[PDB]
């Protein structure tokens, strides 16, 4: 579904959506397309352990440096462990081979409950497949096909879902708006969103590379 979101981004970037006489972004908004999940907080500790993150439902997960993952549901007890090959195991916090990974999940659980800003905090199962950082953004790929790109300098964020063929844009003032990508070609959009959609394309290419 990376290839699907590639064709979706190419289709809108090819229409030059900011280069229109009278742009009308608002006609492309579709609340029904709003994503169920996104990343609300993250901590890059990949020099030692991996990357820890929270999802908007307050569940937490870690993508460990050995490409395994541990996910703790928002009931604080139910666990999922994901091996490198993708094998999924259902655990509870309460096997012994994972005691080291669980005690690191706890560090990240403690961190997320107390420390960072919740992206999308106003608004009311997948795991981090992979991620990377560039000089200007962190790029997060979830197992449900969503791709999230957070931009460091101005805190804007894109959430791309290839299933709804939609993009959610969170701007610097934290305005959360979701758009059908097909309708962005029709009605156009501002230069700031069109720039980030061009960036997303180079980032999905890299995800595909």
């Amino acid at each position: 579904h990376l290839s699907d979101m590639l064709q979706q981004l190419h289709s809108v970037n090819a229409s030059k959506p900011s280069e229109r006489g009278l742009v009308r972004q608002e006609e492309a908004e579709d609340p029904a397309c709003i994503p169920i999940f996104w990343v609300s907080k993250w901590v890059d500790y990949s020099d030692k352990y991996g990357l820890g993150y929270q999802l908007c439902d307050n569940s937490v997960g870690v993508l460990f440096n050995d490409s395994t993952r541990l996910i703790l549901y928002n009931d604080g007890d139910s666990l999922q462990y994901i091996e490198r090959d993708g094998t999924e195991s259902y655990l509870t916090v309460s096997p012994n081979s994972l005691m080291k990974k669980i005690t690191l999940l706890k560090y990240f659980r403690n961190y997320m409950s107390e420390h960072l800003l919740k992206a999308g905090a106003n608004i009311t199962l997948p795991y981090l497949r992979t991620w990377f950082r560039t000089r200007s953004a962190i790029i997060l790929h979830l197992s449900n096909g969503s791709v999230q790109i957070n931009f460091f300098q101005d805190h804007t964020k894109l959430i791309l879902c290839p299933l709804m063929a939609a993009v959610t844009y969170i701007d610097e003032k934290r305005d959360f708006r979701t758009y059908r990508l097909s309708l962005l070609e029709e009605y156009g959009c501002c230069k700031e969103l069109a720039s980030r959609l061009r960036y997303a394309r180079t980032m999905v290419d890299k995800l595909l590379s």
Partner: peptide, 6 residues
């Protein structure tokens, strides 16, 4: 290291 917004 690095972290999301504080």
């Amino acid at each position: 290291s690095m972290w999301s917004s504080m």
